[PDB]
Amino acid sequence: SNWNEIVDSFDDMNLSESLLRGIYAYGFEKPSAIQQRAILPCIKGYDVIAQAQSGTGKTATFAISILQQIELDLKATQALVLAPTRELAQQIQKVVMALGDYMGASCHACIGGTNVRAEVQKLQMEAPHIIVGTPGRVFDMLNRRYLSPKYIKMFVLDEADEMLSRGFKDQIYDIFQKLNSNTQVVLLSATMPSDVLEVTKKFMRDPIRILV
Amino acid sequence: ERYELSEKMLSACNLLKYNIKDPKALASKDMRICLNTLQHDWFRVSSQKSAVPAMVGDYIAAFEAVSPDVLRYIINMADGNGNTALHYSVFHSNFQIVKLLLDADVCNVDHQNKAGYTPIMLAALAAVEAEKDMQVVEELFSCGDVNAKASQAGQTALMLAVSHGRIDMVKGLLACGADVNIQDDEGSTALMCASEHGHVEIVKLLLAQPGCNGHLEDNDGSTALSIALEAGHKDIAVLLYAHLNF
């Protein structure tokens, strides 16, 4: 908690009317504390570290921030989100697509249960505004030059401790090698072990730290 | 029993013909509404998975019947992602429709979408069931710029086909005049890619092409030989060595 402003309403969060409509249609009313504290400076582009439990409304935070950040007329990948598992990545994609039902943004899921060829052809047809998936598959697509880091300004790490527990450290660092240096970084993690803190120290600059 | 255009589609075509040589009138609001209705109709008819070849052919015939300029205008329409009917036709493996678009002889075969890929590059990674489909694919290869490079990483159709180990597709691309010695953004060739991924048969295919240059180096100074050696593919390394130094 090193940031002052806290906003108790989505209506004051300076969001586009499309995103707001998507939010209220999805089933949300008033933002939980984490959103109230973290959403605005995340849209502003600051590096952000959030430490909250799984079930405090973590997803909707960076979902809203990303969806608001996206330049829709730019038909290229602009946001990259990592998740420890396939199911979680699919869940995040579902949430993002649900909150952006009125916007017109695209969200693709990089999971390892899919056929590489067809997925690549889909990418050839359209470079998704938002990619969300597992570190290994995401890095696979980055390394094979199928996913471009050129327009990626957002890098979200959902449940970092989980990804590191499952041994995605190498992949995360490799993706850091792939992405541009000016890329905004946002990390979410319930626990803060040495490796998480090490990543945040290495790649983030002047972050907004929030504890719930 | 020919498929007929709807009244709004036919009249849209008539307005198009009326103002196709009028830039200011084409850019006006109402006319853009018209052109939007027409484009949505055209993509609805030609570019969905469940699209019907006979319907598309009849519609093309009718478009030309109105005006060849109208046909050329409509055929080369692109959506918000830069994708044309040819793109979707290839992507959906509706190669009868691909063939119909090619036979129209007014189709811009080399149009890159906003992702940066051509219909040929899409075809390189497209599912091809029967021999008819592959015939259409090869006709597409021969019609357009087979040696074009994607906007993102400078990938050619051959490089994309090689990267996924598609032997038959590589054969097809080679049969349709794909250049083997072209390099991407990183300076990589199809030979280097095949050597790294370990595709022996594809390496043999590339080396068998007249004028295959195995001396080329990527931006790191690596040749296909050094890449093969570094990746532990010794058989490929022996192939490449025998090729370079005999």
From Swiss-Prot, chain A:
Residues found modified as Phosphothreonine: T134
GO biological process: cytoplasmic translational initiation; positive regulation of transcription by RNA polymerase II; translational initiation
Known role: ATP-dependent RNA helicase which is a subunit of the eIF4F complex involved in cap recognition and is required for mRNA binding to ribosome. In the current model of translation initiation, eIF4A unwinds RNA secondary structures in the 5'-UTR of mRNAs which is necessary to allow efficient binding of the small ribosomal subunit, and subsequent scanning for the initiator codon. As a result, promotes cell proliferation and growth.
Range of the intact protein held here: 25 to 236 of 406
EC numbers on record: 3.6.4.13
Subunit organization: eIF4F is a multi-subunit complex, the composition of which varies with external and internal environmental conditions. It is composed of at least EIF4A, EIF4E and EIF4G1/EIF4G3. Interacts with PAIP1, EIF4E and UPF2. Found in a complex with XPO7, EIF4A1, ARHGAP1, VPS26A, VPS29, VPS35 and SFN. May interact with NOM1. Interacts with PDCD4; this interferes with the interaction between EIF4A and EIF4G. Interacts with RBM4. Interacts with DDX3X in an RNA-independent manner.
Motif (DEAD box): 158-161
Protein family according to the UniProt entry: Belongs to the DEAD box helicase family. eIF4A subfamily.
Molecular function GO labels: ATP binding; ATP hydrolysis activity; double-stranded RNA binding; RNA helicase activity; translation initiation factor activity
UniProt keywords, alphabetically: Acetylation, ATP-binding, Cell membrane, Cytoplasm, Helicase, Hydrolase, Initiation factor, Isopeptide bond, Membrane, Nucleotide-binding, Phosphoprotein, Protein biosynthesis, RNA-binding, Ubl conjugation
Catalytic activity line of the entry: ATP + H2O = ADP + phosphate + H(+)
Domain Helicase ATP-binding: 39-210
Protein name, UniProt field: Eukaryotic initiation factor 4A-I
Sites of the Glycyl lysine isopeptide (Lys-Gly) (interchain with G-Cter in SUMO2) crosslink: K122, K201
Swiss-Prot record, chain B:
Record localization: Cytoplasm, Cell cortex; Cell projection, Ruffle membrane; Cytoplasm; Nucleus
Membrane-traversing stretches: none
Region (Interaction with KIF21A): 1-246
ANK repeats: 29-66, 81-111, 115-148, 153-182, 186-218, 220-246
Function: Adapter protein that links structural and signaling protein complexes positioned to guide microtubule and actin cytoskeleton dynamics during cell morphogenesis. At focal adhesions (FAs) rims, organizes cortical microtubule stabilizing complexes (CMSCs) and directly interacts with major FA component TLN1, forming macromolecular assemblies positioned to control microtubule-actin crosstalk at the cell edge. Recruits KIF21A in CMSCs at axonal growth cones and regulates axon guidance by suppressing microtubule growth without inducing microtubule disassembly once it reaches the cell cortex.
Subunit record text: Part of a cortical microtubule stabilization complex (CMSC) composed of KANK1, PPFIA1, PPFIBP1, ERC1/ELKS, PHLDB2/LL5beta, CLASPs, KIF21A and possibly additional interactors; within CMSCs KANK1 and PHLDB2/LL5beta appear to be the core components for targeting of microtubule-binding proteins KIF21A and CLASPs, whereas PPFIA1, PPFIBP1 and ERC1/ELKS serve as scaffolds for protein clustering. Interacts (via KN motif) with TLN1 (via R7 domain); this mediates CMSC clustering around focal adhesions. Interacts (via CC1 domain, residues 244-339) with PPFIBP1.
Protein name: KN motif and ankyrin repeat domains 1
Organism annotation: Mus musculus
GN (gene name): Kank1
Portion of the full sequence shown: 1089 to 1334 of 1360
